Amino acid sequence: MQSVTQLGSHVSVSEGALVLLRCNYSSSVPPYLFWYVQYPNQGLQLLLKYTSAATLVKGINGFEAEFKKSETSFHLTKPSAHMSDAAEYFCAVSESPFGNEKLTFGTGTRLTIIPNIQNPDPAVYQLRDSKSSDKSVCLFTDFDSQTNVSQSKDSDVYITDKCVLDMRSMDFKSNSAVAWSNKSDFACANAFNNSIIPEDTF
Amino acid sequence: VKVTQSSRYLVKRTGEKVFLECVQDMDHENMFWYRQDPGLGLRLIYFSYDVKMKEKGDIPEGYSVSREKKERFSLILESASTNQTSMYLCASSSTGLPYGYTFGSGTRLTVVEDLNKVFPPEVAVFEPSEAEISHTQKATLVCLATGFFPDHVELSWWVNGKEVHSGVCTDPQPLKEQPALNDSRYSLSSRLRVSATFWQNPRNHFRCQVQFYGLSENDEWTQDRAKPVTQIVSAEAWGRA
């Protein structure tokens, strides 16, 4: 049991695509292997465990991993990525069978799923509220996964990463990115300009 | 069948000594302390296979550990340092039983170099664009939470009493208000989206809530701003015709 490597610490797959997370170990003695998932606001949880009862292990939330002694690997797969599956994933190895003596974990792998934005119309809107603070913010929403939101050129203007909301009952998902300043000479013709799509409402 | 760790967030100061509790109600034999750091995964500091017994993990340096009772297992950092800033994770297992490790929730520690520069977030909400209603039949509110240090916010949306799953997105990670400042204040955005109608109703209350996790009661200061404790800062909102 003394070791584990997780080759490839970040992974990005389109929703519907194969998830495949790697894990190899080094072991002086017969190893029992494990897989932990860590969804955003949460502690670790057990996806599946290898206790030498059988070679192809079935797990939870759709997952599966084949122990190959041949090549010293317990790689984890799900053939079809859900959005739900975005998490840090952890390999671990023990010397005793149920997980009872200590566990050595791997460095981990953060799985990212990219949504299938079916009917995108990119738009950049402007929102205001002057109750908490006189400020103005510009929403780059409804654009589509190909597109990415580059960081500011101006020091005193604040632009955040993209992000996917999903509205259960309407089968609808949409990307969105947020931009703001206090600066008087900033507007949303200024704001997102860097590799933005060439057909967005204003 | 549960493992708590007394604090869920903590602010401590370069040098200050630090106690972290860990406690289980399962009469369990082995307990462990790991730290989780980005890139490095989980790293075992120290462990205990019975009462009174400590043993060192892969990274025990400038850590110390106590097991007076079977329920308990405290971690101690002596002089706290900046790279002992991290996410600290307690686990317990039984030796007889076949049921494996039981993790705690975590304790996030931030160590800060010769000063407490901890401010709650101010939290402005913003209301959806005229164009968006018309164009997309949808309506996106935006909540910014701003001017906080360290990164200890937990941002939630609330509609008409009960919290909301759906149509939400908060920034995985915040951004620095000033990438100049070494210990720069932080800020975070979230979005809640809904149907046009739902917004066009002043029977619909929209609150954006942020919980800071800052200083505690026995912490020492009195400079000319509020005590930056573990308060909730909301902004609120109301639909329109």
Short mmCIF file of C-alpha atoms in Angstrom, two decimals:
data_model
loop_
_atom_site.label_atom_id
_atom_site.label_comp_id
_atom_site.label_asym_id
_atom_site.label_seq_id
_atom_site.Cartn_x
_atom_site.Cartn_y
_atom_site.Cartn_z
CA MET A 1 0.00 0.00 0.00
CA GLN A 2 2.59 2.83 0.52
CA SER A 3 1.60 4.96 -2.68
CA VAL A 4 -0.81 6.56 -5.20
CA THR A 5 -0.57 8.81 -8.27
CA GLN A 6 -3.47 10.53 -10.06
CA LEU A 7 -2.12 11.54 -13.51
CA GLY A 8 -3.97 14.53 -14.72
CA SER A 9 -5.18 16.78 -11.96
CA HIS A 10 -7.72 18.73 -14.08
CA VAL A 11 -10.20 17.22 -16.66
CA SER A 12 -12.91 18.88 -18.79
CA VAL A 13 -15.56 16.86 -20.57
CA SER A 14 -18.67 17.85 -22.44
CA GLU A 15 -21.82 16.65 -20.77
CA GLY A 16 -22.67 13.21 -22.21
CA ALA A 17 -19.06 12.22 -22.70
CA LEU A 18 -16.90 9.60 -21.09
CA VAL A 19 -15.49 10.42 -17.72
CA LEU A 20 -12.11 8.79 -17.13
CA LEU A 21 -9.96 9.58 -14.06
CA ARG A 22 -6.62 7.87 -13.56
CA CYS A 23 -5.16 6.15 -10.56
CA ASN A 24 -2.13 3.96 -10.15
CA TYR A 25 -0.57 2.75 -6.89
CA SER A 26 2.64 1.24 -5.52
CA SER A 27 2.29 -1.39 -2.90
CA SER A 28 4.69 -3.64 -0.90
CA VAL A 29 1.71 -5.89 0.13
CA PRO A 30 -1.77 -6.84 -1.27
CA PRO A 31 -3.59 -3.47 -1.71
CA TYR A 32 -7.21 -2.45 -1.00
CA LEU A 33 -8.12 0.58 -3.10
CA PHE A 34 -10.74 3.35 -2.76
CA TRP A 35 -12.47 6.27 -4.55
CA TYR A 36 -13.70 9.45 -2.81
CA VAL A 37 -15.66 12.28 -4.37
CA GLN A 38 -15.97 15.78 -3.00
CA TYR A 39 -18.86 17.83 -4.41
CA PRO A 40 -18.59 21.60 -3.86
CA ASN A 41 -19.98 22.45 -0.49
CA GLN A 42 -19.16 18.95 1.00
CA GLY A 43 -16.95 16.50 2.94
CA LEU A 44 -15.48 13.35 1.27
CA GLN A 45 -17.72 10.44 0.16
CA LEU A 46 -17.16 6.88 -0.91
CA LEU A 47 -17.86 6.10 -4.58
CA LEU A 48 -16.53 2.55 -4.51
CA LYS A 49 -14.01 0.19 -2.82
CA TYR A 50 -11.80 -2.74 -3.94
CA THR A 51 -11.60 -5.56 -1.40
CA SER A 52 -10.37 -8.33 -3.74
CA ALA A 53 -13.84 -9.91 -4.08
CA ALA A 54 -14.00 -9.08 -7.86
CA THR A 55 -12.11 -7.12 -10.48
CA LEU A 56 -14.64 -4.78 -12.06
CA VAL A 57 -16.15 -2.63 -9.24
CA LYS A 58 -19.52 -0.96 -9.50
CA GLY A 59 -19.97 2.26 -7.56
CA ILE A 60 -22.47 5.01 -6.98
CA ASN A 61 -23.78 7.88 -9.05
CA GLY A 62 -23.12 5.67 -12.08
CA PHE A 63 -19.35 5.03 -11.61
CA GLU A 64 -17.16 1.98 -12.32
CA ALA A 65 -13.32 1.16 -11.99
CA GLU A 66 -11.26 -1.85 -13.02
CA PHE A 67 -8.48 -3.00 -10.77
CA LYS A 68 -5.63 -4.24 -13.03
CA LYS A 69 -2.72 -5.78 -11.04
CA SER A 70 -1.07 -6.17 -14.49
CA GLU A 71 -0.47 -2.49 -14.67
CA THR A 72 -1.08 -1.35 -11.09
CA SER A 73 -4.16 0.79 -11.86
CA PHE A 74 -7.67 1.42 -10.60
CA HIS A 75 -8.96 3.93 -13.21
CA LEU A 76 -12.39 5.39 -12.70
CA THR A 77 -15.05 5.82 -15.44
CA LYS A 78 -18.67 6.79 -16.16
CA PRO A 79 -19.59 6.53 -19.83
CA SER A 80 -21.87 9.59 -19.85
CA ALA A 81 -21.04 12.81 -17.91
CA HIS A 82 -23.83 14.56 -15.99
CA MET A 83 -23.50 18.13 -14.88
CA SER A 84 -23.94 16.92 -11.28
CA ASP A 85 -20.51 15.11 -11.59
CA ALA A 86 -18.26 18.15 -11.23
CA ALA A 87 -16.05 17.51 -8.19
CA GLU A 88 -12.59 16.76 -6.89
CA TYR A 89 -12.03 13.00 -7.11
CA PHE A 90 -9.59 11.07 -4.78
CA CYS A 91 -7.76 7.74 -5.08
CA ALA A 92 -6.63 6.01 -1.94
CA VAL A 93 -4.94 2.81 -0.86
CA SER A 94 -4.81 0.91 2.56
CA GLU A 95 -3.12 -2.33 3.83
CA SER A 96 -6.12 -3.81 5.68
CA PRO A 97 -9.34 -4.63 3.73
CA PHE A 98 -12.33 -2.48 4.92
CA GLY A 99 -10.24 0.80 5.14
CA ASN A 100 -9.23 0.24 8.89
CA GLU A 101 -5.45 1.05 8.98
CA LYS A 102 -4.34 4.43 7.48
CA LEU A 103 -5.15 5.70 3.99
CA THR A 104 -2.65 7.31 1.59
CA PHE A 105 -4.51 9.53 -0.87
CA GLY A 106 -3.57 10.87 -4.27
CA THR A 107 -3.25 14.55 -5.18
CA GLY A 108 -6.73 14.51 -6.71
CA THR A 109 -8.49 15.40 -9.99
CA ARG A 110 -11.05 18.23 -10.51
CA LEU A 111 -13.59 17.17 -13.13
CA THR A 112 -15.21 19.91 -15.12
CA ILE A 113 -18.27 19.41 -17.33
CA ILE A 114 -19.08 21.79 -20.10
CA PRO A 115 -22.84 22.32 -20.78
CA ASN A 116 -24.47 21.74 -24.21
CA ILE A 117 -25.90 25.27 -24.78
CA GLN A 118 -28.65 24.35 -27.21
CA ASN A 119 -30.22 27.73 -28.30
CA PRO A 120 -27.64 30.36 -27.44
CA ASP A 121 -28.27 34.00 -28.10
CA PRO A 122 -25.36 35.90 -26.60
CA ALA A 123 -26.42 39.26 -25.06
CA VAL A 124 -24.85 41.82 -22.76
CA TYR A 125 -27.40 43.52 -20.46
CA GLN A 126 -27.04 46.21 -17.76
CA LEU A 127 -28.44 45.97 -14.25
CA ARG A 128 -28.53 48.64 -11.55
CA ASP A 129 -29.35 49.07 -7.89
CA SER A 130 -28.27 52.11 -5.96
CA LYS A 131 -29.70 50.98 -2.55
CA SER A 132 -26.75 49.02 -1.07
CA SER A 133 -24.15 50.90 -3.25
CA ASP A 134 -24.28 53.26 -6.26
CA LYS A 135 -22.78 50.87 -8.77
CA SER A 136 -23.47 49.41 -12.19
CA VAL A 137 -22.96 45.82 -13.36
CA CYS A 138 -23.10 44.23 -16.89
CA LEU A 139 -24.31 40.61 -17.46
CA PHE A 140 -22.86 38.65 -20.36
CA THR A 141 -25.46 35.84 -20.40
CA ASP A 142 -26.91 33.22 -22.80
CA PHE A 143 -23.69 32.74 -24.72
CA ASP A 144 -22.45 29.24 -25.36
CA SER A 145 -19.69 26.88 -24.27
CA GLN A 146 -17.24 27.39 -27.23
CA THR A 147 -16.77 31.04 -26.03
CA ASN A 148 -14.59 32.01 -23.01
CA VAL A 149 -14.47 35.21 -21.00
CA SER A 150 -11.05 36.80 -20.92
CA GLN A 151 -9.78 38.87 -17.92
CA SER A 152 -9.60 42.72 -17.80
CA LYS A 153 -7.05 45.01 -19.51
CA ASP A 154 -8.03 47.85 -17.08
CA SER A 155 -6.82 47.50 -13.45
CA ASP A 156 -9.79 49.26 -11.83
CA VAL A 157 -12.51 47.13 -13.63
CA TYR A 158 -13.67 43.85 -12.13
CA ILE A 159 -14.53 40.87 -14.43
CA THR A 160 -15.32 37.38 -13.20
CA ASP A 161 -15.18 33.95 -14.85
CA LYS A 162 -18.14 32.37 -16.67
CA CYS A 163 -20.55 30.12 -14.76
CA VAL A 164 -23.61 27.85 -15.57
CA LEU A 165 -27.01 28.26 -13.95
CA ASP A 166 -29.70 25.58 -14.57
CA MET A 167 -33.49 26.09 -14.06
CA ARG A 168 -34.82 22.60 -13.14
CA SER A 169 -38.36 22.63 -14.50
CA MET A 170 -37.70 24.48 -17.81
CA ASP A 171 -34.90 22.06 -19.06
CA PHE A 172 -32.92 25.27 -19.51
CA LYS A 173 -29.28 25.98 -18.78
CA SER A 174 -27.38 29.20 -19.56
CA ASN A 175 -23.82 30.49 -19.13
CA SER A 176 -23.30 33.89 -17.56
CA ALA A 177 -20.34 36.18 -16.63
CA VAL A 178 -20.33 39.38 -14.51
CA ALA A 179 -18.48 42.69 -14.96
CA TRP A 180 -18.35 45.91 -12.95
CA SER A 181 -16.69 49.17 -11.98
CA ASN A 182 -17.39 52.31 -10.03
CA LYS A 183 -15.58 54.21 -12.85
CA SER A 184 -17.75 56.84 -14.56
CA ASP A 185 -16.00 56.19 -17.96
CA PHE A 186 -16.98 52.46 -17.97
CA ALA A 187 -20.04 51.13 -19.81
CA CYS A 188 -21.04 47.72 -21.20
CA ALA A 189 -19.82 48.66 -24.70
CA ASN A 190 -16.39 49.02 -22.98
CA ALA A 191 -16.74 45.97 -20.57
CA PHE A 192 -16.44 42.45 -22.18
CA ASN A 193 -14.56 43.06 -25.42
CA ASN A 194 -11.95 40.22 -25.49
CA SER A 195 -12.91 37.28 -27.91
CA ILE A 196 -16.63 37.82 -27.26
CA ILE A 197 -19.05 36.59 -29.95
CA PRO A 198 -19.97 39.04 -32.92
CA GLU A 199 -23.83 38.96 -32.75
CA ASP A 200 -25.02 39.82 -29.20
CA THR A 201 -28.04 42.08 -28.20
CA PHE A 202 -27.23 45.55 -26.68
CA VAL B 1 -22.59 7.81 13.48
CA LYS B 2 -20.85 11.29 13.15
CA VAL B 3 -17.45 13.18 13.37
CA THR B 4 -17.47 16.96 14.18
CA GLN B 5 -14.48 19.33 14.35
CA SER B 6 -15.22 22.09 16.81
CA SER B 7 -14.66 25.17 14.48
CA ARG B 8 -15.71 25.34 10.79
CA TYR B 9 -13.60 28.44 9.97
CA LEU B 10 -10.77 30.21 11.72
CA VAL B 11 -8.68 33.28 11.48
CA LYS B 12 -5.35 33.12 13.34
CA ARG B 13 -2.20 35.22 13.38
CA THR B 14 1.39 34.48 12.38
CA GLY B 15 2.89 33.20 15.69
CA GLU B 16 -0.33 32.61 17.68
CA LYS B 17 -0.76 29.01 18.92
CA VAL B 18 -3.79 27.09 17.61
CA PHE B 19 -6.02 24.35 18.96
CA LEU B 20 -8.28 22.30 16.58
CA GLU B 21 -10.74 19.85 18.22
CA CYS B 22 -12.04 16.60 16.66
CA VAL B 23 -14.70 14.49 18.30
CA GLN B 24 -16.66 11.30 17.44
CA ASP B 25 -19.67 9.62 18.98
CA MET B 26 -18.88 6.12 17.70
CA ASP B 27 -16.38 4.79 20.34
CA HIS B 28 -14.00 4.45 17.45
CA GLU B 29 -10.42 3.34 17.85
CA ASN B 30 -8.39 5.17 15.17
CA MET B 31 -8.51 8.92 14.43
CA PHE B 32 -6.48 10.91 11.93
CA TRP B 33 -5.63 14.53 11.02
CA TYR B 34 -5.06 15.39 7.33
CA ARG B 35 -4.66 18.73 5.55
CA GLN B 36 -6.08 19.22 2.08
CA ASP B 37 -4.28 21.65 -0.19
CA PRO B 38 -4.85 22.42 -3.78
CA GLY B 39 -2.40 20.39 -5.98
CA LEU B 40 -1.26 18.23 -3.13
CA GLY B 41 -4.53 16.50 -2.24
CA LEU B 42 -4.90 14.94 1.18
CA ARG B 43 -1.81 14.67 3.30
CA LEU B 44 -1.83 12.86 6.69
CA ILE B 45 -0.20 14.82 9.53
CA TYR B 46 -0.74 12.56 12.56
CA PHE B 47 -2.72 9.53 13.76
CA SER B 48 -3.77 7.55 16.80
CA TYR B 49 -4.77 3.81 17.04
CA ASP B 50 -5.85 4.09 20.68
CA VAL B 51 -6.10 6.39 23.67
CA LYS B 52 -2.91 8.23 24.58
CA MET B 53 -1.14 7.00 21.40
CA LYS B 54 0.15 9.39 18.73
CA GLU B 55 2.07 8.63 15.61
CA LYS B 56 3.44 10.91 12.98
CA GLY B 57 2.15 11.00 9.42
CA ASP B 58 3.93 12.03 6.30
CA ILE B 59 3.95 15.71 7.34
CA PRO B 60 4.11 16.09 11.10
CA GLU B 61 6.59 19.10 11.17
CA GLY B 62 5.47 21.95 13.37
CA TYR B 63 2.44 19.90 14.32
CA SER B 64 1.69 18.21 17.56
CA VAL B 65 -1.27 16.11 18.57
CA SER B 66 -3.21 15.05 21.68
CA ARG B 67 -5.41 12.00 22.54
CA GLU B 68 -6.38 12.19 26.28
CA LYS B 69 -9.83 10.67 25.55
CA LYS B 70 -11.25 8.13 23.12
CA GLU B 71 -13.86 10.60 21.78
CA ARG B 72 -11.32 13.38 21.14
CA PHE B 73 -8.21 14.09 19.08
CA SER B 74 -6.84 17.62 19.07
CA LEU B 75 -4.41 19.09 16.51
CA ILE B 76 -1.90 21.72 17.70
CA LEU B 77 0.13 24.16 15.59
CA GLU B 78 2.78 25.77 17.71
CA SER B 79 3.87 29.00 16.11
CA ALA B 80 1.16 29.32 13.38
CA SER B 81 2.62 30.16 9.96
CA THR B 82 1.26 31.33 6.59
CA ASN B 83 1.63 27.89 4.89
CA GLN B 84 -0.07 26.22 7.69
CA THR B 85 -3.08 28.11 6.04
CA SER B 86 -5.19 25.27 4.74
CA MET B 87 -8.18 23.00 4.98
CA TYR B 88 -7.87 20.60 8.00
CA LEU B 89 -9.80 17.34 7.84
CA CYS B 90 -10.49 14.91 10.69
CA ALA B 91 -11.28 11.21 10.18
CA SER B 92 -12.12 8.23 12.41
CA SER B 93 -12.34 4.44 11.77
CA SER B 94 -13.11 1.36 13.76
CA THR B 95 -10.74 -1.50 13.94
CA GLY B 96 -13.30 -4.39 14.34
CA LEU B 97 -15.94 -3.15 12.00
CA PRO B 98 -16.01 -3.23 8.19
CA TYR B 99 -17.23 0.26 7.61
CA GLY B 100 -14.18 2.39 6.88
CA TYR B 101 -13.30 6.01 7.48
CA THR B 102 -15.84 8.57 8.56
CA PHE B 103 -14.78 12.14 7.63
CA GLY B 104 -15.62 15.43 9.26
CA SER B 105 -16.71 18.53 7.40
CA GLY B 106 -13.39 20.32 7.69
CA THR B 107 -11.96 23.34 9.45
CA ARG B 108 -10.56 26.04 7.21
CA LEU B 109 -7.65 27.97 8.77
CA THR B 110 -6.21 31.21 7.50
CA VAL B 111 -2.96 32.52 8.96
CA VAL B 112 -2.18 36.24 8.45
CA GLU B 113 1.25 37.81 8.73
CA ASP B 114 1.48 40.56 11.39
CA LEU B 115 -2.16 41.84 11.46
CA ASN B 116 -5.89 41.32 11.42
CA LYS B 117 -7.25 43.06 8.24
CA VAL B 118 -10.55 41.21 8.33
CA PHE B 119 -13.68 43.02 7.19
CA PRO B 120 -17.08 41.58 6.58
CA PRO B 121 -18.40 41.76 3.03
CA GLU B 122 -20.65 44.62 1.93
CA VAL B 123 -23.31 43.01 -0.27
CA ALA B 124 -25.09 44.84 -3.07
CA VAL B 125 -28.01 43.09 -4.99
CA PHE B 126 -28.91 44.16 -8.54
CA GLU B 127 -32.10 43.75 -10.49
CA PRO B 128 -32.78 42.47 -13.98
CA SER B 129 -32.46 44.52 -17.19
CA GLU B 130 -35.60 45.69 -19.02
CA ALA B 131 -34.14 44.20 -22.26
CA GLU B 132 -33.62 40.70 -20.79
CA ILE B 133 -37.30 40.30 -19.77
CA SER B 134 -38.53 41.22 -23.23
CA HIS B 135 -35.80 39.49 -25.21
CA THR B 136 -35.50 36.23 -23.26
CA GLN B 137 -38.70 36.01 -21.09
CA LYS B 138 -36.19 35.44 -18.23
CA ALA B 139 -34.89 37.69 -15.53
CA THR B 140 -31.48 37.50 -13.82
CA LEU B 141 -30.70 39.12 -10.48
CA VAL B 142 -27.06 39.62 -9.55
CA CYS B 143 -25.61 39.67 -6.07
CA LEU B 144 -22.12 41.00 -5.47
CA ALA B 145 -20.44 40.51 -2.13
CA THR B 146 -17.42 42.72 -1.81
CA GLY B 147 -14.65 44.04 0.39
CA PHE B 148 -13.90 40.97 2.49
CA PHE B 149 -10.80 39.21 3.84
CA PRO B 150 -10.03 36.38 4.26
CA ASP B 151 -12.01 34.26 1.72
CA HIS B 152 -14.57 33.02 4.23
CA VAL B 153 -17.98 33.79 2.65
CA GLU B 154 -20.88 31.36 2.02
CA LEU B 155 -23.34 32.99 -0.43
CA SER B 156 -26.95 31.80 -0.55
CA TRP B 157 -30.13 32.97 -2.39
CA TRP B 158 -33.56 33.12 -0.68
CA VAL B 159 -37.07 33.42 -2.19
CA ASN B 160 -40.18 34.00 -0.06
CA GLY B 161 -38.89 32.35 3.10
CA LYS B 162 -37.31 29.12 1.65
CA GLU B 163 -33.82 28.75 0.03
CA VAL B 164 -33.29 28.14 -3.72
CA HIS B 165 -31.49 25.39 -5.57
CA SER B 166 -32.32 26.33 -8.96
CA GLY B 167 -31.29 28.95 -11.48
CA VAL B 168 -28.23 29.85 -9.42
CA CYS B 169 -24.53 30.20 -10.00
CA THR B 170 -21.87 31.45 -7.68
CA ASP B 171 -18.26 31.99 -8.65
CA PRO B 172 -16.24 28.81 -7.81
CA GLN B 173 -13.45 31.15 -6.65
CA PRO B 174 -13.37 34.89 -5.86
CA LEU B 175 -11.13 37.59 -7.29
CA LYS B 176 -8.78 40.12 -5.68
CA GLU B 177 -10.08 43.72 -5.45
CA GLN B 178 -6.46 44.79 -5.81
CA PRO B 179 -3.92 42.28 -7.35
CA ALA B 180 -1.34 44.75 -6.01
CA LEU B 181 -2.03 44.28 -2.21
CA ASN B 182 -0.29 41.15 -0.79
CA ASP B 183 -3.18 40.48 1.63
CA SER B 184 -5.72 41.92 -0.72
CA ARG B 185 -9.42 42.07 0.06
CA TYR B 186 -11.69 39.80 -2.07
CA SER B 187 -15.03 39.76 -3.88
CA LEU B 188 -17.50 37.29 -5.28
CA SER B 189 -20.47 37.25 -7.69
CA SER B 190 -23.64 35.20 -7.85
CA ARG B 191 -26.66 35.17 -10.17
CA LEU B 192 -30.21 33.96 -9.59
CA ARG B 193 -32.40 33.68 -12.67
CA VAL B 194 -36.16 33.28 -12.97
CA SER B 195 -39.13 33.58 -15.34
CA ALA B 196 -40.36 37.03 -16.32
CA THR B 197 -43.68 36.64 -14.45
CA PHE B 198 -42.10 35.46 -11.22
CA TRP B 199 -40.09 38.67 -11.14
CA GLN B 200 -43.09 40.77 -12.20
CA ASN B 201 -44.73 40.28 -8.83
CA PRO B 202 -44.29 42.28 -5.57
CA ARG B 203 -45.50 39.21 -3.73
CA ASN B 204 -42.01 37.78 -4.55
CA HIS B 205 -39.23 38.64 -2.12
CA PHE B 206 -35.69 38.07 -3.25
CA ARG B 207 -32.91 38.11 -0.66
CA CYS B 208 -29.24 37.55 -1.32
CA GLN B 209 -27.50 36.29 1.91
CA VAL B 210 -23.80 36.12 2.69
CA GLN B 211 -22.28 34.62 5.84
CA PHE B 212 -18.83 35.89 6.78
CA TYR B 213 -16.84 33.66 9.17
CA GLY B 214 -14.37 36.08 10.83
CA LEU B 215 -13.20 36.81 14.36
CA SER B 216 -14.55 35.35 17.54
CA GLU B 217 -15.39 36.79 20.98
CA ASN B 218 -12.04 36.14 22.60
CA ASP B 219 -10.13 37.83 19.84
CA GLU B 220 -8.17 41.00 20.62
CA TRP B 221 -8.81 44.40 19.07
CA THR B 222 -10.54 47.76 19.27
CA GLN B 223 -9.66 49.90 16.22
CA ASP B 224 -12.30 52.35 14.85
CA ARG B 225 -14.41 49.82 12.91
CA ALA B 226 -16.95 47.13 14.05
CA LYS B 227 -16.01 43.76 15.50
CA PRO B 228 -15.70 41.61 12.25
CA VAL B 229 -17.41 38.53 13.73
CA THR B 230 -19.32 35.74 12.03
CA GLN B 231 -22.35 37.74 10.95
CA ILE B 232 -24.72 37.44 8.00
CA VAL B 233 -24.85 40.33 5.57
CA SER B 234 -27.87 40.30 3.27
CA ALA B 235 -29.20 42.43 0.50
CA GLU B 236 -32.92 42.03 -0.33
CA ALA B 237 -35.20 42.71 -3.30
CA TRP B 238 -38.76 43.02 -4.49
CA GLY B 239 -40.42 42.31 -7.84
CA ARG B 240 -41.71 45.07 -10.21
CA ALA B 241 -44.61 45.54 -12.69
#
